[PDB]
Design a protein around this ligand. Structure first.
Ligand SMILES: Nc1ncnc2c1ncn2[C@@H]1O[C@H](COP(=O)(O)OP(=O)(O)OP(=O)(O)O)[C@@H](O)[C@H]1O
Ligand SMILES: Nc1ncnc2c1ncn2[C@@H]1O[C@H](COP(=O)(O)OP(=O)(O)OP(=O)(O)O)[C@@H](O)[C@H]1O
Ligand SMILES: CC(C)C[C@H](N)CO
Ligand SMILES: [Mg+2]
Ligand SMILES: [Zn+2]
Length: 848
């Protein structure tokens, strides 16, 4: 064995050993328990950074742990390759997005290999390849004919100067980011997934996820935004029907989640596009201007929560169906047309938005809810005003005294009796628009025939192959300018027709890739039945909380869709979820910290990202210190959920520990060579060696619990460090001493193998001749945890009367019980009770 730690030499050697043994190339092995550990696959932007290293090292720690415990572990890697970063680099370097993508994959795959993750590279997928995306095209056509996917007009942001559709993130103050031109709102046909049809399933199945973080489930529930409310119709007053037709002439319909406060409604509000708004503004210019200012804005909830709530009265009136009050209709900029009925009632006394609105315009505020003896003040808002749990109704006639649900059900029956309303469940969830007017993306498998309409491409003709010899300019999708792509024949009638030129939302690729990994070479479906039956669901998922809403929702949606098609038989894709904390680093601009000395503007610390160029290139870290030093630093610096600060100090400390680990095994082997590890009964071992074995097996239990249950890797390393500390303070030079040292070192290297497998694989082979993965995860020797028993003297009134042998973990009650049961004590007690039993643990028990 070489004396000094040489990561640059041993890490490639260890990787070749693992590759030649095919330890990570797994099949559907019914002879082993499966374990599917998945890390969120990355965008091939060019090169990874320490954040990506942290993510994938975490996934590899869990994978290797389960591997050592005999699981058949699948840990697949792949590339989320479609998207805008390629197009922007395409128009910047004048290269095809595909070519820029595949070269990025090349460099990043070698970066990944050099870190030594235990990854089945035979299951690698790249989502921009037709062999992958043909199956989401397949699923699209299947759902399209069932109407789960449908086509309808929707609104987009059109830039008249760049001639491109832009997202809400590229429009700033109503203008394009790279043009500064006023953005038009165009209605264009687009394709949607009817995810609202699955809202109840998507919400309720969250309760199955007993091993998900509660905040992630909470975020899913709020995004879906289910409410149980009341449709309530207000009959239009006789003097306010001018210009209204249809149902709008006879009633105004609203949705509310607080029908228990319908008796406290003081005004009503409609959206600017509401027919009441249009009819009342036909002769009032001020209302036209307010309607125009309303449509001149985005319905973005981000902009609306800070938006100044404004409104104008209309002079029209409707009638509350419960108490007969005539209520004035207002046009309000907070009422959104297309959500519910486009109209709402207002109860300022119990809704904070309605309170501030009615405070600005001095509208009535009528209390209908009381929470105990709390005083109601119509000129201040308290939190208990909107209390839905501890309130009872007042000023409500029949309904006085009821709680929320009792008044709800009571109002429900009354409205249905008068035909003036009924209960209704609504959801904030909108359908999933998947059309993108971009080139680098999955083509939508639709053909437009002037006779047949929107026709899906037959399965035999899939994939619709995206042409890769394209260099986008940015003035519109190149597909719409390539007749050799869009000109085709109609698959229904054979006539001249045009392919759809929009491509799919790139979230679609990441909504099912975890299944494609189960059989990534299957050419008869999305995923083979046999492989789906074997791998079931993802056992462990690891990725940042930035993707905890849409991605997860979409992946869960697709899972149910694929299940309903008979492709899989699980309800939920991911059983456990781990959200790693972000890695941060001090920033510099005028720039990478490696191209900087310790002039440019030195600033503070923030997340590692290509935006500020604050990302430490791991390849420079590996060339400098080694893969194991990189992995150890990440796992040791902080709990995986906590944020991780880059530190040259932390890198050096980790490297010194690997040198210490190497030196420890080398100095042990040079003093006598390898021996059989201690095993069996430890009676006869010295106190110091019994204590070391206690430290050893206590450490094994602690690291096993930290990997498997708590998923805290920094404390697991600290526990092995303490074991080594006690090892260093123990005389292990005797025959029994060497045997225990062998046992300690054989366990330490296996306990650390998931975190630093290169050095541990090498050290193990110097200690033991068996395959490390065959030797398995270290077992706990429970006998090594039992400490010796103590002899306690029993005294009756201070006189020595007997002796008891107690455990080293006996309580004060066990010492009292054993002392009262001793024969010498029971004889000197003369049947008389004890006023006190003074107990000195380990010394004496005095019975008085
Ligand atoms: N289209 C709409 N635009 C704006 N506000 C609306 C609209 N429809 C209903 N509202 C108002 O929003 C209230 C609550 O609806 P929301 O979707 O916010 O449910 P919620 O947050 O679960 O309810 P709660 O605030 O009672 O807990 C309704 O009582 C009504 O006053
Ligand atoms: N600084 C970081 N620290 C920790 N994990 C990170 C960091 N940056 C990315 N990751 C994680 O690595 C995986 C891939 O990240 P990727 O950079 O591809 O996407 P992203 O987070 O959307 O990008 P961006 O950093 O530009 O916001 C995800 O699980 C993500 O949470
Ligand atoms: C699961 C996916 C949404 C993850 C992206 N490819 C990278 O952040
Ligand atoms: Mg269960
Ligand atoms: Zn046709």
């Amino acid at each position: 064995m070489q004396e000094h730690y040489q990561p640059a030499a041993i890490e490639p050697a260890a990787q070749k050993k693992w590759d030649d043994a095919r330890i990570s190339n797994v099949s559907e092995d019914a002879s082993k328990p499966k374990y599917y550990c998945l890390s969120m696959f990355p965008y091939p932007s060019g090169k990874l950074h320490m954040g990506h290293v942290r993510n994938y090292t975490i996934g590899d720690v869990l994978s290797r742990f389960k591997l050592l415990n005999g699981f058949n572990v699948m840990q697949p890697m792949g590339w989320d390759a479609f998207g805008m970063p390629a197009e922007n680099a395409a128009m910047k370097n004048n290269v095809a997005p595909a070519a820029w993508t595949y070269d990025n994959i090349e460099y990043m795959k070698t970066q990944l290999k050099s870190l030594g993750f235990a990854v089945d590279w035979e299951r690698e997928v790249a989502t921009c390849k037709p062999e992958y995306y043909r199956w989401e095209q397949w699923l699209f056509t299947k759902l399209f004919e069932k109407g789960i996917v449908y086509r309808k007009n929707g609104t987009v942001n059109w830039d008249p100067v760049d001639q491109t559709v832009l997202a809400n993130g590229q429009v700033i103050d109503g203008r394009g980011w790279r043009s500064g031109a006023l953005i038009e709102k165009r209605e264009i046909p687009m394709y949607y997934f009817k995810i609202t049809d699955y809202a109840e399933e998507l919400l309720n199945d969250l309760d199955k996820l007993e091993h998900w973080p509660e905040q992630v489930k909470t975020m899913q529930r709020n995004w879906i935004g289910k409410s149980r409310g009341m449709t309530v119709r207000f009959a239009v007053s006789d003097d306010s029907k001018q210009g209204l037709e249809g149902d709008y002439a006879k009633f105004l319909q609203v949705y509310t989640t607080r029908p228990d406060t319908l008796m406290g409604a003081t005004y009503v509000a409609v959206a600017a596009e509401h027919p009441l708004a249009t009819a009342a503004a036909a002769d009032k210019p001020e209302l036209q201007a307010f309607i125009a200012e309303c449509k001149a804005g985005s319905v973005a909830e981000a902009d609306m929560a800070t938006m100044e709530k404004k409104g104008v009265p209309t002079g029209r009136y409707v009638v509350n169906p419960l108490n007969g009050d005539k209520l004035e209709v207002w046009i309000a900029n907070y009422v959104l047309w297309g959500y519910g009925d486009g109209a709402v009632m207002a109860v300022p006394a119990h809704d904070e938005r309605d309170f501030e609105f009615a405070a600005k315009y001095n509208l009535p505020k009528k209390q209908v809810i009381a929470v105990g003896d709390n005083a109601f003040d119509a000129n201040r808002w308290q939190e208990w005003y909107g209390d839905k749990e501890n309130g009872v109704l007042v000023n409500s006639g029949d309904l006085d005294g009821l709680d929320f649900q009792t008044a709800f059900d009571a109002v429900a029956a009354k409205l249905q009796s008068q035909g003036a309303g009924e209960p209704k469940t609504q959801y904030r969830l909108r359908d999933w628009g998947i059309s993108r007017q971009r080139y680098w993306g999955c083509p939508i498998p639709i053909v437009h025939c002037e006779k047949c309409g929107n026709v899906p491409v037959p399965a035999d003709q899939l994939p619709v192959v995206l042409p890769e010899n394209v260099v986008p300019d940015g003035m519109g999708s190149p597909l719409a300018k390539m007749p050799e792509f869009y000109e085709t024949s109609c698959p229904c009638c054979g006539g001249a027709a045009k392919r759809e030129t929009d491509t799919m939302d790139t979230f679609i690729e990441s909504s099912w890739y975890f299944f494609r990994y189960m059989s990534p070479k299957f050419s008869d479906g999305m995923v083979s039945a046999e492989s789906a039956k074997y791998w079931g669901a993802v056992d462990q998922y690891i990725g940042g909380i930035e993707h905890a809403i849409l991605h997860l929702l979409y992946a869960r949606f697709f899972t149910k869709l694929m299940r309903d098609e008979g492709l899989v038989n699980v309800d939920e894709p991911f059983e456990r979820l781990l959200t790693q904390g972000m890695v941060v680093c001090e920033t510099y601009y005028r720039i990478n910290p490696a191209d900087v000395e310790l002039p440019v503007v030195i600033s503070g610390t923030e997340k590692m990202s290509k935006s500020k160029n604050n990302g430490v290139d791991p390849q420079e870290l590996i060339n400098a210190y080694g893969a194991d030093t990189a992995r150890l630093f990440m796992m040791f610096a902080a709990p995986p959920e906590q944020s991780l600060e880059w530190s040259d100090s932390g890198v050096e400390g980790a490297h010194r520990f690997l040198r210490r680990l190497w030196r420890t095994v080398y100095e042990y082997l040079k003093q006598g060579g390898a021996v059989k590890a201690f095993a069996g009964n430890q009676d006869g071992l010295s106190k110091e060696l019994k204590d070391l074995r206690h430290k050893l097996h206590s450490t094994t239990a602690k690291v096993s619990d930290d990997y498997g249950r708590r998923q805290q890797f920094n404390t697991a390393i600290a526990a092995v460090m303490e074991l080594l500390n006690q090892y260093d303070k123990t005389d292990t030079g005797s025959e029994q001493g060497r045997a225990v040292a062998q046992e300690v070192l054989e366990a330490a290297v296996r306990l650390l193998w998931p975190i630093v497998p290169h050095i541990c694989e090498t050290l193990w082979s110097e200690l033991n001749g068996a395959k490390l993965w065959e030797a398995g995860w270290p077992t706990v020797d429970e006998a090594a945890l039992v400490k010796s028993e103590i002899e306690v003297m029993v005294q009756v009134n201070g006189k020595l009367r007997g002796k008891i042998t107690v455990a080293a973990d006996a309580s004060k009650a066990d010492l009292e019980a054993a002392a009262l049961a001793n024969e010498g004590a029971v004889k000197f007690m003369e049947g008389k009770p004890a006023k006190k039993i003074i107990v000195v643990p380990g010394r004496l028990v005095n019975i008085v």
